[PDB]
Design a protein around this motif. Structure first.
Motif, PDB file in Angstrom:
ATOM      1  N   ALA B 145       0.846  -1.288   0.106  1.00 23.94           N
ATOM      2  CA  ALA B 145       0.026  -0.052   0.071  1.00 23.94           C
ATOM      3  C   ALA B 145       0.971   1.261   0.048  1.00 23.94           C
ATOM      4  CB  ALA B 145      -1.057   0.089   1.097  1.00 23.94           C
ATOM      5  N   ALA B 146       2.252   1.163  -0.051  1.00 20.11           N
ATOM      6  CA  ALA B 146       3.116   2.213  -0.180  1.00 20.11           C
ATOM      7  C   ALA B 146       4.472   1.895  -0.705  1.00 20.11           C
ATOM      8  CB  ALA B 146       3.234   2.875   1.371  1.00 20.11           C
ATOM      9  N   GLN B 147       5.277   2.818  -1.007  1.00 21.61           N
ATOM     10  CA  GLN B 147       6.342   2.608  -1.880  1.00 21.61           C
ATOM     11  C   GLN B 147       7.230   1.776  -1.253  1.00 21.61           C
ATOM     12  OE1 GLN B 147       7.789   6.557  -1.909  1.00 21.61           O
ATOM     13  NE2 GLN B 147       9.098   6.224   0.158  1.00 21.61           N
ATOM     14  N   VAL B 148       7.790   0.687  -2.246  1.00 19.67           N
ATOM     15  CA  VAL B 148       8.464  -0.596  -1.888  1.00 19.67           C
ATOM     16  C   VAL B 148      10.077  -0.112  -1.490  1.00 19.67           C
ATOM     17  CG1 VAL B 148       9.511  -2.709  -2.697  1.00 19.67           C
ATOM     18  CG2 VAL B 148       7.100  -2.033  -3.238  1.00 19.67           C
ATOM     19  N   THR B 149      10.552  -0.360  -0.229  1.00 19.08           N
ATOM     20  CA  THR B 149      11.734  -0.123   0.154  1.00 19.08           C
ATOM     21  C   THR B 149      12.840  -0.865  -0.129  1.00 19.08           C
ATOM     22  OG1 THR B 149      10.724   0.631   2.038  1.00 19.08           O
ATOM     23  CG2 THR B 149      12.996   0.797   2.161  1.00 19.08           C
ATOM     24  N   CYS B 150      12.734  -2.398   0.025  1.00 22.32           N
ATOM     25  CA  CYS B 150      13.592  -3.141  -0.640  1.00 22.32           C
ATOM     26  C   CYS B 150      13.065  -4.458  -1.261  1.00 22.32           C
ATOM     27  CB  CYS B 150      14.789  -3.724   0.489  1.00 22.32           C
ATOM     28  SG  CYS B 150      16.157  -4.377   0.287  1.00 22.32           S
ATOM     29  N   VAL B 151      13.654  -5.196  -1.890  1.00 25.10           N
ATOM     30  CA  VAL B 151      13.393  -6.413  -2.451  1.00 25.10           C
ATOM     31  C   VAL B 151      14.513  -7.419  -2.439  1.00 25.10           C
ATOM     32  CG1 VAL B 151      11.289  -5.956  -3.935  1.00 25.10           C
ATOM     33  CG2 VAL B 151      13.552  -6.021  -4.843  1.00 25.10           C
ATOM     34  N   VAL B 160      11.345 -17.743  -4.627  1.00 31.79           N
ATOM     35  CA  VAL B 160      10.991 -17.065  -3.623  1.00 31.79           C
ATOM     36  C   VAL B 160      11.897 -15.915  -3.242  1.00 31.79           C
ATOM     37  CG1 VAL B 160      11.274 -17.207  -0.906  1.00 31.79           C
ATOM     38  CG2 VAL B 160      10.640 -19.224  -2.230  1.00 31.79           C
ATOM     39  N   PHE B 161      11.216 -14.739  -2.860  1.00 29.62           N
ATOM     40  CA  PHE B 161      11.965 -13.393  -2.517  1.00 29.62           C
ATOM     41  C   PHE B 161      11.255 -12.808  -1.301  1.00 29.62           C
ATOM     42  CE2 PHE B 161       9.398 -12.691  -6.139  1.00 29.62           C
ATOM     43  CZ  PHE B 161       8.918 -11.457  -5.888  1.00 29.62           C
ATOM     44  N   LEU B 162      11.884 -11.520  -0.854  1.00 35.41           N
ATOM     45  CA  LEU B 162      11.196 -11.067   0.123  1.00 35.41           C
ATOM     46  C   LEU B 162      10.765  -9.721  -0.292  1.00 35.41           C
ATOM     47  CD1 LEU B 162      13.391 -11.952   3.108  1.00 35.41           C
ATOM     48  CD2 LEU B 162      10.771 -11.634   3.509  1.00 35.41           C
ATOM     49  N   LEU B 171       6.466  -8.831   2.902  1.00 36.64           N
ATOM     50  CA  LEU B 171       5.865  -9.890   2.160  1.00 36.64           C
ATOM     51  C   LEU B 171       7.162 -10.963   1.878  1.00 36.64           C
ATOM     52  CD1 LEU B 171       3.225  -7.694   0.117  1.00 36.64           C
ATOM     53  CD2 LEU B 171       3.016  -8.915   2.314  1.00 36.64           C
ATOM     54  N   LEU B 172       6.795 -12.086   2.018  1.00 38.28           N
ATOM     55  CA  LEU B 172       7.544 -13.071   1.304  1.00 38.28           C
ATOM     56  C   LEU B 172       6.752 -13.921   0.214  1.00 38.28           C
ATOM     57  CD1 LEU B 172       9.649 -15.779   3.247  1.00 38.28           C
ATOM     58  CD2 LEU B 172       7.929 -16.657   1.603  1.00 38.28           C
ATOM     59  N   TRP B 173       7.213 -13.908  -1.107  1.00 40.51           N
ATOM     60  CA  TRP B 173       6.807 -14.067  -2.401  1.00 40.51           C
ATOM     61  C   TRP B 173       7.215 -15.485  -2.750  1.00 40.51           C
ATOM     62  CZ3 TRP B 173       3.791 -10.301  -4.839  1.00 40.51           C
ATOM     63  CH2 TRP B 173       3.716  -9.155  -4.218  1.00 40.51           C
ATOM     64  N   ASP B 174       6.568 -16.528  -3.103  1.00 38.79           N
ATOM     65  CA  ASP B 174       6.631 -17.638  -3.939  1.00 38.79           C
ATOM     66  C   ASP B 174       6.008 -17.278  -5.163  1.00 38.79           C
ATOM     67  OD1 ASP B 174       6.755 -20.386  -5.038  1.00 38.79           O
ATOM     68  OD2 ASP B 174       7.514 -20.844  -3.185  1.00 38.79           O
ATOM     69  N   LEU B 187       8.674   1.099  10.356  1.00 37.97           N
ATOM     70  CA  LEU B 187       9.100   0.668   8.996  1.00 37.97           C
ATOM     71  C   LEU B 187      10.319  -0.224   8.721  1.00 37.97           C
ATOM     72  CD1 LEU B 187       7.797   3.645   7.142  1.00 37.97           C
ATOM     73  CD2 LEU B 187       6.356   1.885   7.923  1.00 37.97           C
ATOM     74  N   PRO B 188       9.971  -1.149   8.078  1.00 39.97           N
ATOM     75  CA  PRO B 188      11.267  -1.747   7.775  1.00 39.97           C
ATOM     76  C   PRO B 188      11.971  -1.183   6.593  1.00 39.97           C
ATOM     77  CG  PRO B 188       9.480  -3.266   6.967  1.00 39.97           C
ATOM     78  CD  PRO B 188       8.891  -2.141   7.660  1.00 39.97           C
ATOM     79  N   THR B 189      13.368  -1.253   6.578  1.00 39.30           N
ATOM     80  CA  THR B 189      14.209  -0.312   5.579  1.00 39.30           C
ATOM     81  C   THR B 189      15.156  -1.161   4.621  1.00 39.30           C
ATOM     82  OG1 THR B 189      15.833   0.206   7.169  1.00 39.30           O
ATOM     83  CG2 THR B 189      13.892   1.678   6.923  1.00 39.30           C
ATOM     84  N   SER B 190      15.527  -2.649   5.229  1.00 33.81           N
ATOM     85  CA  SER B 190      16.338  -3.294   4.761  1.00 33.81           C
ATOM     86  C   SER B 190      16.173  -4.899   4.742  1.00 33.81           C
ATOM     87  CB  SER B 190      17.971  -2.826   4.822  1.00 33.81           C
ATOM     88  OG  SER B 190      18.027  -3.049   6.183  1.00 33.81           O
ATOM     89  N   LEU B 191      16.522  -5.668   4.197  1.00 31.37           N
ATOM     90  CA  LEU B 191      16.364  -7.067   4.122  1.00 31.37           C
ATOM     91  C   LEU B 191      17.667  -7.725   3.594  1.00 31.37           C
ATOM     92  CD1 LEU B 191      13.088  -7.390   2.134  1.00 31.37           C
ATOM     93  CD2 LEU B 191      13.113  -7.593   4.703  1.00 31.37           C
ATOM     94  N   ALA B 192      17.907  -8.956   4.168  1.00 31.72           N
ATOM     95  CA  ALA B 192      19.054  -9.701   3.670  1.00 31.72           C
ATOM     96  C   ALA B 192      18.665 -11.122   3.954  1.00 31.72           C
ATOM     97  CB  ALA B 192      20.335  -9.323   4.399  1.00 31.72           C
ATOM     98  N   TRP B 193      18.849 -11.968   3.079  1.00 29.09           N
ATOM     99  CA  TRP B 193      18.558 -13.611   3.420  1.00 29.09           C
ATOM    100  C   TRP B 193      19.953 -13.953   4.203  1.00 29.09           C
ATOM    101  CZ3 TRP B 193      14.445 -16.454   3.073  1.00 29.09           C
ATOM    102  CH2 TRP B 193      13.481 -15.937   2.202  1.00 29.09           C
TER     103      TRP B 193
END
Ligand SMILES: Nc1ncnc2c1ncn2[C@@H]1O[C@H](CO)[C@@H](O)[C@H]1O
Ligand SMILES: Nc1ncnc2c1ncn2[C@@H]1O[C@H](CO)[C@@H](O)[C@H]1O
Lengths: 609, 295, 6, 4, 609, 6
Positions: B145-151, B160-162, B171-174, B187-193
């Motif tokens: 519902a708002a601008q995407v910070t990280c994928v 799979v991605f985040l 969100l976790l995507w398959d 708000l989350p700002t960064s991701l890392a597997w």
């Protein structure tokens, strides 16, 4: 030249406008009722006279009535008669004619000021103006010379305030009507003109039209209407005010036509800073406050479209750099210049090209508190200046300098030379000046002169706002291009500041010998500044720098006009007052009659520190 | 190769060769363009003279990755996802596609595990999955519902991605699922597997807290965590970047081991060296490429 | 505005 | 025509 | 169509503005700072980031900045963040960007309303508006559908239509209904219902934002729009908004000129509207012909309506046919009395009717306006002759020489009795025969509750000095309301029938069932009148006489707006009050919440007897 | 002035 024809006989109105418009006139002063059709309003049987009282409004279009016709009051209407029946009939009839002109939507309406007592006329006009909604202007047709002084000396037993008589008629009328915006002058120009000082008092009046009889026109060798040298001078002065000219009378050069009387004026017009100030004449503005308010980009553009001021700063910096680095020390002495309030960067460019043409080396600082002008300054530094110019985004008062300056250069001068806190800004910008350092400008003085202007007085009254003191507008200086005004005496210096100053509160008393009868409406403030020794910038009207339009004069109004007589001096006192937060001015007239002290404690106008 | 690169260096990537890729953009001044720079001598960065390759891009460089060894997939501020490719001599950077299919600034790009598909998050709230071979968007997803910070693409499962966004969703995507996204509930700002643990990822929020999630928390920084990079070690260390101009290297328990304050502006991207596994190169908006030796 | 006035 |  | 391009990436500004102008857009919405160039204002070292913060002013001319560029706030600026450091940095950055846009002199500035809580954004905007002097408009970018409702249903484990209007309403209420804050509406793929679009149409919408993603594709490939979207574009084109195209070109085979060309195509495919153009939401004051004498131009505006005078002529035709049988045609003379004859269009209508009816009449033209009596008497001398007798008297105080078969008047206003038709025709019915007819026979006024935020701001802007500071809310306004929303159907308020053979004081209670959530801003008043049996004149928005622009609706404001929800009923009381001197109206809303009684004792608005 | 208004 926009001109009209004053006819007092219109047999048919459509044919008459046709004949008037062919000859080249732009409007037509005509009677809306028949000038001889005297009407009764109180007494039978003539009160009940049948039929229409005048001609219909359907004879011209609405746009024709609203643009082309200036109406005249009928000559028999004497509201100031000594006979009460005549007086009441004239009140009723003048109300009828005024209301019919309002009904027709005429743009103007001529009324005659041909006698000393015009108080009942003033009351009926005042009551018409305040009754209903209408937007017609009222041109009081007042002679330059009274009609009992233009008379021939041909009466054996009656041989013939002399030149200042009809002006006192007009002054009494406009004072009774409370300086209305809708009452102006239509001035009659006879064969005999008054002196130059009388014509100057008239030129400070709301003159919207000038009546020129065809009888004052002389004849050349070919037979055409011309005017005397004094008449031509008066026409030129009135052409400055952009008045309209009304031709009255009959064709006294019967071989030619009224196209000749009109063509002489259309000729004499074409044989007539001023381009910059078009449209800004008698238009009041608020003086700028760059220290408290952040200027817009366009304000800076108007600042920088003046090349004379920046050429003068560049020449002053040139001369100061020469008198500070001898040519033996030319290639090894670096001069610290500090441009204080650098703006969008014209003083920095002036310093750069001044040191370039002086063949000397400078290390330059551009201090500016405007963050948005700092954006422009930093883009200038990145693209052009480089390491030569260091851009500082600070206020020169609390900036901590890395080194002291040989020269500080600023343009913190207003129209009164110190109303933008140049003394206070250069006081704090003085501790990073060397003990033999120079400031440019090193000197500035402000000058005051008393003026008269009914139009400026009405503009100041029209500046009244709600949620404010009802007379606060009279305690504010206004940056105004003074056009329709009369200056009563030569300017004298008010306040002087010199930099570096190794208290900015000031008190000045100025006596102005007023060699003429006048009415005081305010004071005009100018300034001179010495940037370096012979390099000066002045807006003072006798030593005005040519073509230099960066500054308009200041006007300090007074709340109530002060009538001044011949030989009566005017004493005014100004104060430059301040505290830790604010700086303001106070002024008061103390002679010939006192006024209140204007702006006490800065209640109406302060300059914010 | 431009004469000068821009002040705001935005990304730095170490490929398996050990060469460094810098992406820069001018975020101030007259022209808001970007540039790419390959430095096969990583210690000479960011001096534009000693560069292996360089190119000027039409707009900014918001993010970039490596597509294999000679591919550079760039998120541009013009809504473009673009593929630059090095030549055989590694001397020029040459563009393959530049697709303008996001409606606003593409803020992040990640390459899926197969290396032939990518994802792109943008400020238009839409997340696109791209097929890099055919230069098309396989699938657009308006799930935030708002601008995407990280994928963040999974290193193990290609589909799979985040994603994180300003609507406070992770969100976790398959991609193979009928309803591909599922919410992993500041708000989350960064991701890392996590590089090895298939079901574990760290994420940093806008308050400076780095957390570890199984598909732990630590107040590492004072301002938002801009990026989170994992070391190539068998037991990875996590490099945390932030807008407080600070670098912090954390162990497997999010306990702090290293902290660098060498940067005078925001720290944008960190990357560990494949050759010297203790070397960590971070770039910043102060035109400073700092190489750290992590204990 | 002109003349150092708004 | 227009001369004094 | 005036249209703009919304870009969030401008690499070079001059090249981009050139390309945008080549495509055909009039303005360009662009970020004044870099959208990704987040700035720190509190914490070092990033607080002290060197260099320029944005582009130079000098990259475009001044007129380019003031006429061509609409600024945008950076997307990272969240003044209502839950993190205090983020929201303080965002307050400072929003202030910096707003001040740079004020400095650049941009005409407009886009700010986003994309979440429910926007109070700190409202405070920073309200503090900018009250700081300094600047004249930029603020376009709040709000969607038709909230973005959390436009998201796809693809998440496995995860107020509907009136959400974003309440966002906008809360924002504009916090900012105190400023004239400088307006709406830029985003029209997405999914479109809300008809009544949501009606509140939105009642708002200050200055721009409409059309993403390229909402455009459909035809068989030739060009962008098109759905039928509901086309309907919305037509309703917005009625308001003369500017359309902003956002996003990228999804029809990459075609150019970006195609999205603009479709809007131009819809623009070229969309008497009363031509008359009323330029008068929309312009508040006049209702005429008072009895207390004020009108002007020639006012009467001329009256007489440019052929429908009303054709209707009066038809009514007189039918009445003359009814009152005189064919056998009594040449011996029966019908006394008609035209009361308030004007400049004489009703007298001409009566004469043409008596010719068309082929009946013999003796006509009286009564008129109290002494200036329109001039026109009437010139008519009488030239055309009418002895058939028409012109009386220069008030119909109330005039003593007739005979009784009248018919009295005809045009004394109706926009509310049918605000010009004192009952009181004038009451005193003018004693010279009517016992079987006499009055045209108009009867007249009714109709009221409907309306919402219009622009009209509320216009009424606020009518605050005049030297009077009650809220007396502008207690006056009816003649207004061609355009940008409004009518909450409920009109219902009859007051009915007057003439002759009255049995008090003109009246009291009405009207209950309006609202079926929609709204915010009541005033009451719009219309009228119907039966002149003769089946001959009517109506200004009601459903039964409006076609092409008849004599009367605009009347508007009764309320001092504070009254929020209404669905299923409630607005109960309002209207009183027609009078004394010997004056007539006025008083109004008060009693449900859902009470308002004060508006205009008690006629303290703000009376009609003069 | 139009529509019965000044
Ligand atoms: N104290 C100050 N420090 C720096 N610049 C100033 C100061 N006062 C005024 N200015 C600048 O001087 C110029 C004209 O006075 C403007 O650029 C204004 O911003
Ligand atoms: N009492 C009155 N007597 C005569 N004419 C009137 C009266 N009141 C209004 N009128 C005229 O009616 C017309 C429309 O109201 C105008 O010409 C106005 O002057």
């Amino acid at each position: 030249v926009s001109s009209g024809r004053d006819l007092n006989c219109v047999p048919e109105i459509a044919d008459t406008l046709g004949a008037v418009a062919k000859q080249g006139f732009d409007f037509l002063c005509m009677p809306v009722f028949h000038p001889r059709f005297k009407r009764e309003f109180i007494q039978e049987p003539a009160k009940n006279r049948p039929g229409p009282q005048t001609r219909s409004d359907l004879l011209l279009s609405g746009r024709d009535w609203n643009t082309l016709i200036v109406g005249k009051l009928s000559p028999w209407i004497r509201p100031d008669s000594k006979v009460e029946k005549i007086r009441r009939n004239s009140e009723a009839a003048m109300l009828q004619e005024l209301n019919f002109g309002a009904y027709l939507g005429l743009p103007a309406f001529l009324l005659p000021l041909n006698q000393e007592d015009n108080t009942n006329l003033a009351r009926v006009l005042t009551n018409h103006i305040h009754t209903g909604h209408h937007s017609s202007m009222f041109w009081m047709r007042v002679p330059l010379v009274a009609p009992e002084d233009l008379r021939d000396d041909i009466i054996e037993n009656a041989p013939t305030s002399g030149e200042e008589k009809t002006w006192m008629w007009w002054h009494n009328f406009r004072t009774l009507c409370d300086y209305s915006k809708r009452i102006a002058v239509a001035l009659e120009i006879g064969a005999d003109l008054p002196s130059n000082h009388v014509i100057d008092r008239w030129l400070g009046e709301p003159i919207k039209a000038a009546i020129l009889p065809t009888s004052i026109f002389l004849t050349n060798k070919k037979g055409f209407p011309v005017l005397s040298k004094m008449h031509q001078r008066l026409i030129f002065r009135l052409l400055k005010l952009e008045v309209q000219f009304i031709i009255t009378g009959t064709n006294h050069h019967s071989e030619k036509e009224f196209c000749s009387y009109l063509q002489y004026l259309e000729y004499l017009s074409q044989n007539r800073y001023e381009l910059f100030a078009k449209g800004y004449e008698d238009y009041l503005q608020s003086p700028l406050q760059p220290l408290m308010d952040n200027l817009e980009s366009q304000t800076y553009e108007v600042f920088e479209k003046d090349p004379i001021k920046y050429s003068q700063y560049q020449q002053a910096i040139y001369k100061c750099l020469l008198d500070r680095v001898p040519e033996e020390e030319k290639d090894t002495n670096v001069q610290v210049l500090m441009v204080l309030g650098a703006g969008r960067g014209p003083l920095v460019n002036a310093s750069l090209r001044a040191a370039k043409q002086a063949d000397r080396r400078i290390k330059l600082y551009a201090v500016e508190k405007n963050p948005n002008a700092v954006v422009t300054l930093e883009n200038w530094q990145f693209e052009e200046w480089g390491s030569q110019v260091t851009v500082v985004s600070s206020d020169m008062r609390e900036w901590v300098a890395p080194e002291k300056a040989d020269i500080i250069v600023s343009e913190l001068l207003g129209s009164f030379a110190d109303n933008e806190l140049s003394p206070e800004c250069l006081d704090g910008a003085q501790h990073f000046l060397k003990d033999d350092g120079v400031s440019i400008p090193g000197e500035y003085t402000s000058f005051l002169a008393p003026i008269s202007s009914s139009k400026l007085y009405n503009e100041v009254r029209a500046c009244r706002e709600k949620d404010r003191d009802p007379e606060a507008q009279f305690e504010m200086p206004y940056v105004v291009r003074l056009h329709n005004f009369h200056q009563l005496s030569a300017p004298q210096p008010c306040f002087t500041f010199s930099h570096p100053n190794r208290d900015n509160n000031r008190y000045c008393t100025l006596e102005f010998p007023v060699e003429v009868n006048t009415v005081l409406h305010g004071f005009a403030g100018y300034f001179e500044t010495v940037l370096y020794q012979d390099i000066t910038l002045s807006i003072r009207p006798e030593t005005h720098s040519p073509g230099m339009f960066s500054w308009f004069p200041i006007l300090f109004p007074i709340k109530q006009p002060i009538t001044v007589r011949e030989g009566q001096t005017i004493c005014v006192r100004f104060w430059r007052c301040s505290n830790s937060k604010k700086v303001w001015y106070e002024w008061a007239v103390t002679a010939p009659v006192c006024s209140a002290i204007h702006n006490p404690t800065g209640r109406s106008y302060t300059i914010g520190l | 190769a431009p004469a000068c690169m821009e002040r705001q260096l935005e990304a730095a990537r170490y490929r398996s060769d050990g060469a460094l890729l810098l992406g820069a953009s001018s975020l101030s001044g007259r022209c808001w363009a970007g540039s790419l720079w390959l430095f096969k001598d990583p210690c000479a960065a960011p001096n534009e003279g000693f560069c292996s390759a360089g190119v000027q891009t039409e707009a900014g460089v918001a993010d970039l990755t490596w597509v294999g060894e000679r591919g550079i997939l760039v998120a541009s501020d013009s809504g473009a996802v673009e593929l630059w490719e090095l030549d055989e001599n590694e001397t020029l950077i040459v563009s393959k596609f530049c697709k303008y299919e996001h409606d606003d600034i593409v803020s992040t790009v990640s390459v899926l595990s197969s290396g032939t598909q990518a994802v792109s998050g943008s400020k238009d709230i839409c997340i696109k999955v791209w097929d890099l071979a055919q230069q098309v968007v396989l699938s657009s997803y308006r799930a935030h519902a708002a601008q995407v910070t990280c994928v963040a693409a999974s290193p193990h499962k290609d589909s799979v991605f985040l994603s994180c966004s300003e609507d406070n969703r992770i969100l976790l995507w398959d991609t193979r699922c009928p309803k591909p996204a599922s919410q992993i509930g500041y708000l989350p700002t960064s991701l890392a597997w996590h590089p090895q643990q298939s079901e574990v990822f760290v994420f940093g929020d806008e308050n400076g807290t780095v957390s570890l999630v199984d598909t732990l928390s630590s107040a590492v920084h004072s301002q938002c965590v801009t990026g989170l990079v994992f070391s190539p070690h068998s037991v990875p260390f996590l490099a945390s970047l932030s807008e407080d101009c600070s670098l912090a290297v954390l162990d497997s328990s999010l306990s702090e081991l290293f902290r660098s304050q060498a940067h005078r502006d925001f720290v944008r991207d960190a990357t560990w060296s494949p050759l010297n596994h203790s070397l960590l190169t971070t770039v910043g908006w102060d035109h400073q490429v700092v190489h750290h030796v992590v204990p | 505005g002109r003349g150092r006035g708004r | 025509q227009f001369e004094d």
